[PDB]
Amino acid sequence: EVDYSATVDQRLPECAKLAKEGRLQEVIETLLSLEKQTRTASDMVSTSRILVAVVKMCYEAKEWDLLNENIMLLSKRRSQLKQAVAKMVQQCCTYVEEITDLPIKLRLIDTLRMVTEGKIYVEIERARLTKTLATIKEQNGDVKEAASILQELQVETYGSMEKKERVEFILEQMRLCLAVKDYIRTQIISKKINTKFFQEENTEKLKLKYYNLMIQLDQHEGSYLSICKHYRAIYDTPCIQAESEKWQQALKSVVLYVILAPFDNEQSDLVHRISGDKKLEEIPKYKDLLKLFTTMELMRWSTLVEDYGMELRKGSLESPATDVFGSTEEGEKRWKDLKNRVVEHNIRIMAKYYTRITMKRMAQLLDLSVDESEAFLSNLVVNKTIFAKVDRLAGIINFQRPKDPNNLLNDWSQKLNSLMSLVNKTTHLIAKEEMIHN
C-alpha cells in the first residue's frame, strides 16, 4: 500500500535513545500516533515493529504499570492487525520467563492471558502462558488451582499447536489431575490422546510419561489386565528395549500383572502372547511363574511363597523386584490378590477334573480353612464364575451340572459322529497301505 518501512527505521532508534534518557510517557504517545498511521495504512511489518517496540521500552524501564496498560491498550485499538498483536504477545511472553518477581510476573500473565483470550492467532501463546501460570500456581503449592487452571484449556482443538506439543499439554493436565486425585477427570483427558501418535518419530519420552500416568490412574481402580497392557506398551518402546535394566523391569511387571488379572478370554490370550516372547529367559523365575499359571494343574500357595516369594516381594540385587508386591499398602493388597488368583486357579482346575470333592479336601488343596474355602467358593458361585453345588451336611462339593436329556443324548450323538468319521478315516488309511504293500 503506502508501506512506511524506513519511516519507522528513522523514529525507532531515535525513540530508543529518548526512552533511556527518561522520556517514556511522551514517546509512547509519539509511537501511538505512529502506530495509528501504520495500522490505518495496513502496514503489517511496520505496525508489528512498533507494538514490539513499545513493550520493550516499558520492559527495559521497569514500568510494570505502563507495560500492562499498553498491552491492553494496543491490543484493543480499532481494526488492529492480528499479526502485529501476535508479535507483541510473542515478544511479551519472552519477558514473562525473564521476570522472576512473582507478583509482577503474575500481573503480566493475567494481562497477557486476557488480551489473548478467544483469539486463534495467539492461541499457542495463551496456552504456553496458561502452562506457565499453572507451574507458578503449583511450585508455590495449591495444586488444586493449578489443575483447574490447566484443565480448562481444550488444547486438542488448538490446530496451530504442534501435535507433539499438544500431547505434552494433555499429559500435564493428567499429571495435575492425578496429583490432585481426580481419577474421574483423568480418564476423560486420557481419551484425548490417540495411542497411534506414539508410532511416529522421536516422541518415546511422551509415550513413557503417558503410560506411566495411565498405570497410576488404573492402579487406583484395580484393573490389573489394563495395567498389564500399559506395561506391555512401555516394554515395546525402543528406548526401554535398548537397555537391559529397563525392559527387564517392564517385562517383570507385564508377567506379574497378567497373573493378577482374573481369568477370562482376554487374559488367557494375553498370557500366550507374553509367554511367546523369548526375552523371558533373561528372567527365568518370572518365566516359570507365568508357566505355573498356564499349566492345567494345581499349584500350591505355600510352594509359591517358598519358591517365588523372595524373588517377587524382596527380589535380588542381580534382578531387582518390581513394585507389584512391595511392602507398601498397594503391594500388600496385590499380594493378597495374588493368593486369590492362585486359589481361583485351583478351583478352576478342581472343576475341570473333579466331579465331586470334599470341602475338607478342597480346603487342604487351597491352603485355606474350610470356612474360608467355602466362603471363597460361595463367592465364585454367586458371580457365576464357577458352577458348584455345596452339600454342607456331607461335606461334598458337586462340580457337575444336572444332565439335560438333550445334553446326554447330544453327547451320545457326538460320539457317533466322531466314530463314523474315524471309521471313514481309517478306511482311507487302509487304502494307502493296500497301495504301498501290493
- Cα separations (Å) of 290 from 69, 249, 297, 298, 336? 67, 15, 13, 14, 18
Q: What CA–CA distance (Å, rounded) separates 217 from 49?
A: 48
Hey, what amino acid is at 437? H
Distance, first Cα to last Cα, the chain: 105
Q: What CA–CA distance (Å, rounded) separates 42 from 3?
A: 8
Experimental method: cryo-EM
Contact 126, 111 (CB under 8 A): no
- Cell numbers 508357566 correspond to 291
Output the nine-digit C-alpha cell for 98.
Answer: 525473564
- Cell numbers 505355573 correspond to 292
- Cα separations (Å) of 58 from 24, 61, 84? 8, 5, 17
- Cα separations (Å) of 181 from 46, 80, 131? 50, 44, 20
Q: What CA–CA distance (Å, rounded) separates 279 from 270?
A: 16
- Residues forming beta bridges with residue 389, ordered by sequence position: 398
Output the nine-digit C-alpha cell for 384.
Answer: 457365576
Residues in the chain, total: 438
> Which phi and psi (to 5°) does residue 237 adopt?
-70, 135
Q: Where are the beta strands (DSSP E) in 186-342?
A: none
Closest CA to 69 of 55, 79, 82: 55
Question: Which helix (DSSP H) or strand (DSSP E) does residue 239 occupy?
Answer: helix 238-241
Hey, what amino acid is at 306? E
Contact 281, 354 (CB under 8 A): no
Resolution to one decimal, Å: 2.9
Output the nine-digit C-alpha cell for 268.
Answer: 488367557
**Residues 21, 25, 31, CA angle at the centre, nearest 5°?**
95
Contact 300, 269 (CB under 8 A): no
Question: Which helix (DSSP H) or strand (DSSP E) does residue 391 occupy?
Answer: strand 389-391
- Cα separations (Å) of 218 from 231, 320, 379? 11, 23, 24
- Residues forming beta bridges with residue 315, ordered by sequence position: 320
* Chain breaks of the chain after residues with C–N above 2.5 Å: none
3-state secondary structure of 62: coil
Question: Which helix (DSSP H) or strand (DSSP E) does residue 396 occupy?
Answer: strand 396-398
Q: What CA–CA distance (Å, rounded) separates 275 from 120?
A: 51
3-state secondary structure of 76: coil
- Strand order of the β-sheet with 389-391 is 356-358, 396-398, 389-391
